[model samples]
Target: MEPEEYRERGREMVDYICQYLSTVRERRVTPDVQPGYLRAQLPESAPEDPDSWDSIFGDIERIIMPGVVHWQSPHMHAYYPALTSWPSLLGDMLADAINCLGFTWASSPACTELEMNVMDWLAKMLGLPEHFLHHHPSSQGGGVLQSTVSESTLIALLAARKNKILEMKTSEPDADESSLNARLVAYASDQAHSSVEKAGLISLVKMKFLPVDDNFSLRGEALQKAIEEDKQRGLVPVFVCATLGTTGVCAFDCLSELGPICAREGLWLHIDAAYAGTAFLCPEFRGFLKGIEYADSFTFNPSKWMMVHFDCTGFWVKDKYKLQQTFSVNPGVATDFMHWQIPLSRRFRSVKLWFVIRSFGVKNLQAHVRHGTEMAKYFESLVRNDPSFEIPAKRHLGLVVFRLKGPNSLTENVLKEIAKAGRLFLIPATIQDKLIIRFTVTSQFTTRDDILRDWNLIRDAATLILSQ
Candidate 1:
């Protein structure tokens, strides 16, 4: 409301974020505070009057700083990386200020156009097939920005549902849609993200978890067997999800093996690359996606690894109109995103993608991906060198899954002590019956020194656990 004051306050915020970004490495990774800490610190209700920016800034330090994980910290190793850079933050801030709902092209042409261009740019950058680019002649494919990989899965299933239903109708011209939907089933490797199962819950499609090979990869034979068995049971298979890299252990499902089976079966193959897909920007890693041409839809989160921050996934469908075939906005001769997603209103999210891509360029982005992988490799080597520690899964991209060589309880105790130590933070993953620590390279600020320091902390925690 106050323009002059807004300018002054904004600069302060910029300086604050920059300062915190620079200093976060030294801070504790997780909050030392407990649940309801903030509730006790601040009023239960909003203030009656406007608070000065200066006062609110002070309150952030006093009431907010200690109650959340310092995700940007170099030592904050958990889940997948959701790193943000200056360019990305600036783009997000500007988008907030613009406050335009890019639901329809007419609503915000720049929003729609920029998204189309950046999505295509990303497709080309990832070595994705040309059909995914909107500008390519005879290309029906296009992409959209999604909030999470979870939402992408749900949307993809919804599209496949309609596509399958339509195919059934074409056959009989009188088939009951409800019965067809009830008979529909989809498949994914057991190691696929929880989001895939969640998507099935939302779509009401029976999601089956097929067993993976010894390397934790789903291959053609297993998928073919499942489809054959399901067909015998009179079940209709409409969709199958392939993971380029799985969540628990970053294991890669065999796309080359799964692709042809899906094609022959007329099932829509959706590839959820989530965290590991960022590595596809490197040509060496792109080999993992050799049969991507067979996919019906694909999604990867730049939010996780490309420093675009959260809330943006590059989601492309081989036929954008397949999504359109399910829903529409009734806007003649124009693209309105209301058809492509769960919601009609969307943020100007493309701004961040455009800004991050333009700022970092393809080569620098590849370097950043390589850096995370390189750091993880170094950490894996260190884990291998120590006879006390054993890597349960082969190191992949930027994650190392390791545990103590002895009982799973000892590794559990090690992680417990490490959390209590509060110097380096990590999460755990279960590899079959064995408990393992998931140490992911989550921040670009990590260095040789940070890795060494974190490794020393792990060693110290292991020692403390064993001393008992």
Candidate 2:
């Protein structure tokens, strides 16, 4: 297709997107297709000749739409919300069409500088400590947009490992990567997300799933003891992941208590608040943000609840150079964005974040979070009133981990039935090492009636499973 043809088709596609989002409430929240359904729609070979954009988009509607679980829908209560509003989409399209990698200032000056400026702006918006902001001329602190929480965690772990190696090199300059064994252990609350384990695996280090208290926050004493034991055993305790809000339940890991402990131990503290980090926008959630100053790194998804869409994880580091050293190949001339991120090519994802923040403003963003949290509380009461279900942890955010009062298998069967029906979508979690269904109300369009629909669907699914 010619450039003009491309522009016309793009305009049509954008219109299609706008129309779809405006009427998403009328579409099914979840797809009814079975596994391997998408495979049948795909071709065995690529076209030798260029095809019209219309032909490609026609397949997208016929093949892709049927398989997608509408994450942007109000009825989408499963997992955390991955919202994409009009403003974010426009930013994404501009980034896509421009396609600047932002590897270096010279590579795409606007992309690199925009990210730096926007990162500082966003960090301050969430009330991050001065240490985490890059505005300090002499300080190397800054934020970068990572592709996902896993990449952020791995980057933090690698930086901590590099710092430890640097300290070792100062004393034993002959030491190398092979010198330190995989005996270096990292710690996270037992309630932490599986991605933490994945990061450890990628870093090829030992990991300790530290036990949590009833509140699901990792205890300072427990972590101290674990670190001391590792030291005694000649294992390096290099990093500790303190979650602001965990995955299994919306429980924080007492950052106030754990932060000082990490500072004293010289362990890198990386905070993973993938789901509940959106709450940090509101000043009232300050209690959960204790010790954020002591943290070497922190990350969460504006994509998750902040309506910035997927493909962006807001990650910050106390020392930006640590990330550059850990990720970059050469030091002299490569001190740019690509050296800090895993991918050499990255979207100007900060544009979407900037759009979301500006469009919502801090007040509306806080209200959006508050409304979701309040809805979850109402759902918590609904769970309790049923008598056959129990809320497993503190509903500090927009998620309630719950389970039926009967056999665990019954709840499992009920979840399966719910998925099979595909009207109201939700997945389950394991709390206290036990199975439970997690209902997260975070969609920007979700209302009280939507929550009611979820509760009623869950009950009906349970009844259907019990009849068997």
Candidate 3:
């Protein structure tokens, strides 16, 4: 109930977190428990009397540890990496202490200002166009921290729809907003994240999943054809959500190809490079972002690979006023990020970002990215050497997608067996009709030995399945 207890408890909490982070490799990447196991173990309801910290602390290891997926474990190859560092944890601790709902600048000046500062810093690190930076005088473009790339897409869609609706009203003088919304359609590559489709659904607009080319990148021609066809059918194209680094196969849509079409057609182009955006920190990797100059807005999640913890997506827009047009109530002694996304209240999410960036520095962070990518390349080499494996998708980044040389069943069966062994954790993705394992290296602690261990276990599982 007092500062005295907090001083000791907080230190204990830090020690506990450190122990968990450092020793996570010893734990299983995926839990064995069934769905409701935690529910059965936990109390049905809150108790009138608070339990002692000892019981609560002990229960973490006893009860909670068994249920966690241990995403930090080097053996965890499932999905994209959600990394967290000591700096991030400390920043979050401070954020939780202050706990300000920074809806407006007046509510918390530092929350908005710090976010602005970091965003510009990050934009510069990524070598983004000067127009996307807040410090660019006479430019309305600015950055904000969003919870996820999904929110970024949703906000962009809403803003684009609002702009188009108002534009229609100007043209027709009496167009109904609801009717206009129904006619408004959005575009995203078939290889784009599922969240893009979900954003369109949430925004009540038609989302056209345009087919990608052999490279799995959406081309300018396909997009242009689709937009024209939709227009011919009397639908208005309002937005194009392109992918710099797509979810499946880590494919990048041809932004250089897509950007011009969106500009000519007056479609808002929003690029979501959630996982691969962190790669841009390395000057060599910025080539993939060539078409970024044409984007109305761009979003990427540092939480995925930057060790900034979850809920820290770097969001930049060409015009801050457009976002405010849809999300604003009224604002600013400073930049009120409340008008930036779907939520009115947001945390000091930037606190963690500031800490992570400062601690890791640019060179160290770039090194972290390079190491993870190199590990992925190493894993790919292993798969290539083994004739039994056929790589379904190949990319230079963290994710390497491969499958058995035979039918999908062999790969599927081996995956099941590997999970049963519980030595490593992985998830599969489909490229074309082939179901392939997506091995993504995100944990900074991941090593060549760990990769070999995981691959050997996979090989053993495959052998067992095939011999039968």
Tens-digit per-residue lDDT, 1-468, candidate 2: 789888888888888988888788777878887788876677778888887777888977788888888877777777777877878887887888888777777878788777888888778778888777767666577888888888888889888887787777787777676477355789999878888899888878788999888887798999989998889988989999998888777788888889999999899999998877888888998788877888989898888888887888988898887787877656543347776777677667877778877877889989988988888888888888887787777788888888877778988998898887677777877875578988888677778888888789898987788788
lDDT of 3 by residue, 1-468 (tens): 579988898889888988899988889787898867888787889978989888988898899888888888999888899999999988998999999988988898888889888999999998888888888887788888988898888888988999889888988787688887998889999998989889877878989999988878899999989988999999998999989878778988888999888888899999999998999999988878988889999999999999988978999999898889897645233677778878789989988899999998999999999999999988999999999998766576999888888888999998899998586888877888889988888789889998998989998998899898
Candidate 1: clashing pairs of residues: none
Per-model CA lDDT versus the true structure: 0.87, 0.82, 0.88
Write the number of the candidate with greater TM-score, choosing between 1 and 2: 1
**Higher-scoring candidate on lDDT, 2 or 3:** 3
What residue runs in model 2 are displaced by over 4 Å at the alpha carbon?
328-335
Runs in model 3 lying further than 4 Å from the true structure: 329-333
